[PDB]
């Protein structure tokens, strides 16, 4: 992972999160559960969707082959014709395959990037009030009820609240 999040410091994925690609798992007095960060999940959807549509629209005016015929004494132009359509066919096959290979790599690193940025969003809010365990989890130095958790999820965490 280019950004070191997915399969990096965060060992695995969550089978339990079904509402989105990236999100949170919390553990307090009121209970436990998974929650998807809609903002970063939607931004990922809007990205990959555009990427697919852009790959498609760039290859909508490709090169269609037509049929031509040549007699026994036009072998040169017949051959020229054949190599030419095989020619365009090869470069457009190269294009599609290469583009897919390249953007697939980008897509996976895109998701990897999103996960780390989400991690840093929570990390930069908590600061002292919790400690990095090292697996994508922060252990709190105070009590964080659902209201406190949601404040973290929507980037409105009120840091002024002690430790030790």
């Amino acid at each position: 992972g280019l950004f070191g999040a997915i399969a990096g410091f965060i060992e695995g994925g969550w089978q339990g999160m079904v509402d989105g690609w990236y999100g949170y798992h919390h553990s307090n007095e009121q209970g436990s559960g998974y929650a998807a960060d809609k903002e970063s999940t939607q931004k990922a959807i809007d990205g990959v969707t555009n990427k697919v549509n852009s790959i498609i629209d760039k290859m909508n005016t490709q090169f269609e082959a037509v049929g031509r015929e040549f007699n026994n004494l036009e072998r040169r132009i017949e051959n020229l014709n054949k190599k030419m359509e095989d020619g365009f066919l090869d470069v457009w096959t190269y294009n599609a395959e290469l583009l897919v290979l390249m953007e697939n790599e980008r897509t996976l690193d895109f998701h990897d990037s999103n996960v780390k940025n989400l991690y840093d969003k929570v990390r930069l809010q908590l600061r002292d009030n919790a400690k990095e365990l090292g697996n994508g989890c922060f252990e709190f130095y105070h009590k964080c009820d659902n209201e406190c958790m949601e404040s973290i999820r929507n980037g409105t965490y009120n840091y002024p609240q002690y430790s030790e």
Partner: protein, 321 residues
């Protein structure tokens, strides 16, 4: 004690994608963008049926090979299907001038209306019902191309022919005619009396003078003689003029080009299947929303883009384990 974790989605998907640095990567979501399926049939294209030449070639069709009577009158078509090697072609051995250029015109034509420009009955001073050969048999009997008439001498006389036809139609006319190349001087006189013959043809654009070529040739379909056919597009209000004192294979039926459009001559051994599609290939039809396909390059209708790949899948989700 309370804690919060950041994580990512994972599921039970074994869908794989490839990258530049690693192949067969398992992801949570993937979109396949390649169609690899056809129905194995030749279908109509948006309601309009293709003209399926079965065991006949374009030549047999247009010249009217007796083995090709299925195509004497042909409705409007979407595309044409012809086999790799049609068995019914030039029943009488010979050649077709600019055959490929003509087949190329057929790619921009959708409908032919067969009309009689010079009736066989109109030949008074020549024999018009003896121009037959065992090389073009119909039901056992010696016959000939149906759209052209092989004229010979009458009462040991072949008067020089002067025939005109004006195209009073609003559509272009595909006009076909031919010359007979005998195999010796005895055959020339026995058929046309005159030992030295010609065929002159003129439009506003055409100016050709044909002469027969005597030559000893190997037998093809039992005949050493040869038929050489020529064609022209007659513009509306233009006229075609024939002059000849022998060896003339005159037109009787010509073709009104009443429908121009997007067509194709498709090569396939397949026959018609009672079906309909928006995209047709020589080996079957495609019904797909896919942007790509790998079935056949030669395509007609609203089709995906052909690619030589056997696999094309786009990652949409993320890694999975």
């Amino acid at each position: 004690q309370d804690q919060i974790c950041i994580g990512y989605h994972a599921n039970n998907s074994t869908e794989q994608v490839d990258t530049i640095m690693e192949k067969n990567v398992t992801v949570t979501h993937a979109q396949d963008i390649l169609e690899k399926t056809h129905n194995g049939k030749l279908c109509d294209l948006d309601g309009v049926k293709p003209l399926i030449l079965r065991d006949c070639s374009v030549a047999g069709w247009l010249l009217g090979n007796p083995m090709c009577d299925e195509f004497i009158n042909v409705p409007e078509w979407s595309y044409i299907v012809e086999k790799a090697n049609p068995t019914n072609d030039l029943c009488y051995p010979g050649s077709f001038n600019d055959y490929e250029e003509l087949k190329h015109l057929l790619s921009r034509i959708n409908h032919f209306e067969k009309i009689q420009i010079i009736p066989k009955s109109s030949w008074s001073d020549h024999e018009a019902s003896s121009g037959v050969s065992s090389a073009c048999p119909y039901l056992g009997s010696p016959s000939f191309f149906r759209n052209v008439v092989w004229l010979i001498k009458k009462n040991s006389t072949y008067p020089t022919i002067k025939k005109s036809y004006n195209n009073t139609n609003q559509e272009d006319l595909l006009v076909l005619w031919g010359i007979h190349h005998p195999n010796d001087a005895a055959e020339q006189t026995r058929l046309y009396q005159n030992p030295t013959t010609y065929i002159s043809i003129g439009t506003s654009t055409l100016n050709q003078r044909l002469v027969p070529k005597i030559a000893t040739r190997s037998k093809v379909n039992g005949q050493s003689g040869r038929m050489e056919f020529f064609w022209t597009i007659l513009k509306p209000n233009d006229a075609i003029n024939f002059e000849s004192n022998g060896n003339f294979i005159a037109p009787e039926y010509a073709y009104k080009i009443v429908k121009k459009g997007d067509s194709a001559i498709m090569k396939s051994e397949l026959e018609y299947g009672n079906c309909n599609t928006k995209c047709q290939t020589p080996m079957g039809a495609i019904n797909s929303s896919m942007p790509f396909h790998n079935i056949h390059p030669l395509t007609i209708g609203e089709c995906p883009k052909y690619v030589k790949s056997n696999r094309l899948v786009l990652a949409t989700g993320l890694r999975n384990s």
